[PDB]
Amino acid sequence: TNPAHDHFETFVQAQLCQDVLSSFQGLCRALGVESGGGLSQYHKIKAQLNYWSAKSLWAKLDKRASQPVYQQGQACTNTKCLVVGAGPCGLRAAVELALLGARVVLVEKRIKFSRHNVLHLWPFTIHDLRALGAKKFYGRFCTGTLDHISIRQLQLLLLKVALLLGVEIHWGVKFTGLQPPPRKGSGWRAQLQPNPPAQLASYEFDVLISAAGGKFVPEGFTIREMRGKLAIGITANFVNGRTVEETQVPEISGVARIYNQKFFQSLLKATGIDLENIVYYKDETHYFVMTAKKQCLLRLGVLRQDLSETDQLLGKANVVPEALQRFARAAADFATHGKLGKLEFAQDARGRPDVAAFDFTSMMRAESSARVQEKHGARLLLGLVGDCLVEPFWPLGTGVARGFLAAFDAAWMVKRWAEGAGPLEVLAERESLYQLLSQTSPENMHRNVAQYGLDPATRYPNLNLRAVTPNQVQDLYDMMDGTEELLHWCQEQTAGFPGVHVTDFSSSWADGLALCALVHHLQPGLLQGMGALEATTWALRVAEHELGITPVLSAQAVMAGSDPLGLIAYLSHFHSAFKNT
Ligand SMILES: Cc1cc2nc3c(=O)[nH]c(=O)nc-3n(C[C@H](O)[C@H](O)[C@H](O)COP(=O)(O)OP(=O)(O)OC[C@H]3O[C@@H](n4cnc5c(N)ncnc54)[C@H](O)[C@@H]3O)c2cc1C
């Protein structure tokens, strides 16, 4: 026989994270390869596992690997990546970057997939996953007309996929932030807790894909918060015995109070439970997600006091596990007309009943989806993916969909950045894409989901990659280190003016003074210390009428220091006309 086949089948069927890892390592030792080895490792693995069980898997993976956008793994063949997070979106990112031909290295905080809550899947995410061999690695995946997958199962899927592609992963390793390059010849590094392996800690990368969940975002990355009415979401998982009775209970896609008022009034007047919404997904567990307002959860002793800060309102000290269990179970039992039977809680990864309470009040969004940093010549492309990019709304089942799109758009970004386009280009393109995200839906995206790929134009109808231009995105380009001579020259023309001191093509010129010092020196003397707006408009008008130089920047642009490039373009004209003099 072939022992490798058993290693494979075992790897394939692994239901625990660390069993996936050991079954893969054994399969690897069986096939003269080591994990973490680019797409070449993938090629050997399928070279030696060309047999009945593996053949369709390789088939699907190959069909995707050879979609023109990857160039047979030559696109990002010179890119070095670090993905932060083994969440679905991180793994997905990992697969796209791996296929691109890049070196993918992934760090995950945890060492198991703990999460049982269920995610609604959009048609395209279903198809995608499918063409990654989802029913091979799961099989109970979206049976018939199922719509959703539990978190850890999705994690499992994409884990096996990323592994097979030779993505290098590290578990129990938290990324705390960046290490800038020590000197000109160096690269950007991660700071890792606790002990990074001496090779991971020394690993230099040029792309950072952060995919670390709702409440982690790197440095330079700034978040925009905005809340709605105070909402509190409770999710629950019950034992699913997969009995005939149990199976014959309809799901509850989304039953909202704004319509089913008599259902909810009935709930309340028979249970004291006052809800805004409830959802029931039938998965590995019976899953319920429901929304309440504060006064109900107080009245029922689910919460101990009326705390103003929501992060404290739903903290371990103020949440009463007893009551939240009884509340959850009561709602659950009512919405399903007891058809489900006497409900037992599933455990969380830690053994207490699977009921949690979350803050639903926020609609978080990050200002950008990417940034570029540059030191000692080393460029680094930061890009966000997942819950850390846009905060999903759980009832309306966004999460997976918008995260995967973010991940594709990140992979696209990376692809451009390998092709060697200017930082501002890569970023501008990414921001035009980003604009679309927070309002996406299957209805305002393309219909042929069968053919979705990295290329933005296969997914987003009426696509404008020019919505955002390199000029505006100068903010996202962070340089801590041809234009030499324009600065030197301006310093020369402006020496001697009392309040003027030229050091850049931004803040030096914010107050009008700077510009006047030039103009006055170039054409004396119309001739003092004016204002701020006054001086800027003085300079621009006078340079325009006297020197023959029309304004590139607005007076406000110059005053706000918003457009370095624009100011350089303006200045370069005084340079053109008067340098040889
Ligand atoms: C406890 C919990 C319950 C949820 N329940 C629901 C639900 O019921 N319904 C729903 O629609 N959505 C739910 N979500 C959100 C859902 O998981 C997301 O919609 C989906 O997982 C996409 O998230 P993500 O991949 O961006 O990151 P996440 O899935 O949030 O995971 C990010 C991963 O990165 C890891 N990580 C974080 N920081 C670091 C670091 N510094 N270094 C290394 N690794 C790190 C984390 O351990 C995690 O494994 C839940 C999320 C959580 C955390």
From Swiss-Prot:
The keyword Acetylation does not apply. It catalyses: L-methionyl-[F-actin] + NADPH + O2 + H(+) = L-methionyl-(R)-S-oxide-[F-actin] + NADP(+) + H2O; NADPH + O2 + H(+) = H2O2 + NADP(+). It comes from the Eukaryota. GO terms for cellular component: actin filament; ciliary basal body; cytoplasm; cytosol; endosome membrane; hippocampal mossy fiber expansion; intercellular bridge; midbody. One of its GO terms (molecular function) is monooxygenase activity. Associates with the SH3 domain of NEDD9. Interacts with VIM and PLXNA3. Interacts with RAB1B, RAB8A, RAB10, RAB13 and RAB15 (in their GTP-bound forms); binding to RAB1B is of low affinity compared to other Rab proteins; at least in case of RAB8A and RAB10 can bind 2 molecules of the Rab proteins simultaneously. Interacts with STK38 and STK38L. Interacts with GRAF1/ARHGAP26, GRAF2/ARHGAP10, RAB8A, RAB8B and RAB10; may bind simultaneously to GRAFs and Rabs and connects GRAFs to Rabs. Does not interact with RAB1 and RAB11A. Its cofactor is FAD. Belongs to the Mical family. The C-terminal coiled coil part contains the plexin-interacting region. The modification Phosphothreonine is found at T469. Monooxygenase that promotes depolymerization of F-actin by mediating oxidation of specific methionine residues on actin to form methionine-sulfoxide, resulting in actin filament disassembly and preventing repolymerization. In the absence of actin, it also functions as a NADPH oxidase producing H(2)O(2). Acts as a cytoskeletal regulator that connects NEDD9 to intermediate filaments. Also acts as a negative regulator of apoptosis via its interaction with STK38 and STK38L; acts by antagonizing STK38 and STK38L activation by MST1/STK4. The keyword DNA-binding does not apply. FAD binds at C89, E108, K109, R110, R115, H116, N117, F175, Y287, D387. Signal peptide: none annotated. Residues 1-481 are annotated as: Monooxygenase domain. This is [F-actin]-monooxygenase MICAL1. It is found in: Cytoplasm; Cytoplasm, Cytoskeleton; Endosome membrane; Midbody. It comes from Mus musculus (Mouse). Residues 482-579 form the Calponin-homology (CH) domain. GO terms for biological process: actin filament depolymerization; negative regulation of apoptotic process; regulation of regulated secretory pathway; sulfur oxidation. The chain holds residues 7 to 613 of 1048 of the full protein. Expressed in the postnatal and adult hippocampus; found in dentate gyrus, the polymorphic layer, cornu ammonis (CA) 1-3 and in mossy fibers of the striatum lucidum. In adult hippocampus strongly expressed in CA3 pyramidial neurons. Keywords: Actin-binding, Coiled coil, Cytoplasm, Cytoskeleton, Endosome, FAD, Flavoprotein, LIM domain, Membrane, Metal-binding, Monooxygenase, NADP, Oxidoreductase, Phosphoprotein, Zinc. Its EC number is 1.14.13.225, 1.6.3.1.
